[PDB]
Structure to design on (288 residues):
């Protein structure tokens, strides 16, 4: 169903829900999953669609981290719990994208689009992902 | 007129106005033109007057980005209307500098100087490129 890249990200997203002991996996954790670590090879974060688009990867991260703090940290029994309805929607939307794109396995990139569409970092100090034109152009230019 | 080095910067500035879908070119886009890409020979950014003037050019880039995100609109059809009276003044100032220097063409050195005369950071302890006197101290190491 999912590519090795998407699986890496979702493994990490679910992992993060348990690492930060959150009540549920949220779009924030997937964004955080994309920000695995500032690895030079980090396609979804250092080399991503936002940094080469409109906003600084370092600041984007700090917002996401603030959101990881804002999502309550709970005991191991209430911790993690679920993938969440929110992502049931994001990932199903990523699947729709796969069909649009003629790709048999879910790309982490498709997750980035579905994910980004739900999220919105509406700070006056906006870090909200650059919209779809910059995101898509940069996605199309990946590797190749 | 302008030579290729100045034209590159000027071209980039106008491009940047369109990269931000803004109706007009502003001093901020030119400052952004000064800091495009990490190519050392670019006096406007790396082997610059800024480092020699004891300033952090990446911090300055953060300042520029902080200002770029404050551009009031990114509307597509409204984009690319004018170079702006503000920069009319700057480019006219560059011409004044050419007269001051007996120079048959505007180099990036001149276009830098002209904007710097009209540039600012709305900051007391500006992290801006070093002020004009230093700009001259180091700019005058170029050509002759």
């Amino acid at each position: 169903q999912f590519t090795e890249r998407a699986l890496t990200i979702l493994t990490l997203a679910q992992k993060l829900a348990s690492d930060h002991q959150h009540p549920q996996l949220q779009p924030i954790h997937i964004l955080a999953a994309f920000i695995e670590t500032p690895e030079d090879g980090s396609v979804p974060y250092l080399q991503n669609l936002i940094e080469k688009g409109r906003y600084d990867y370092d600041l984007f991260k700090k917002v996401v981290n603030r959101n990881l703090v804002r999502i309550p940290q709970q005991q191991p029994a209430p911790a993690e719990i679920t993938p969440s309805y929110a992502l049931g929607k994001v990932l199903q939307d990523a699947a729709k994208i796969q069909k649009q794109q003629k790709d048999s396995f879910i790309a982490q990139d498709h997750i980035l689009f579905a994910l980004f569409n739900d999220s919105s970092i509406q700070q006056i100090f906006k870090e909200a992902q650059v919209d779809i034109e910059a995101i898509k152009q940069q996605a199309l230019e990946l590797r190749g």
Notes: The interface with chain A takes residues 62, 65-66, 69 of chain B (CB under 8 Å). Helices of chain B lie at 4-19, 27-34, 49-52, 57-68, 85-101, 108-118, 132-139.
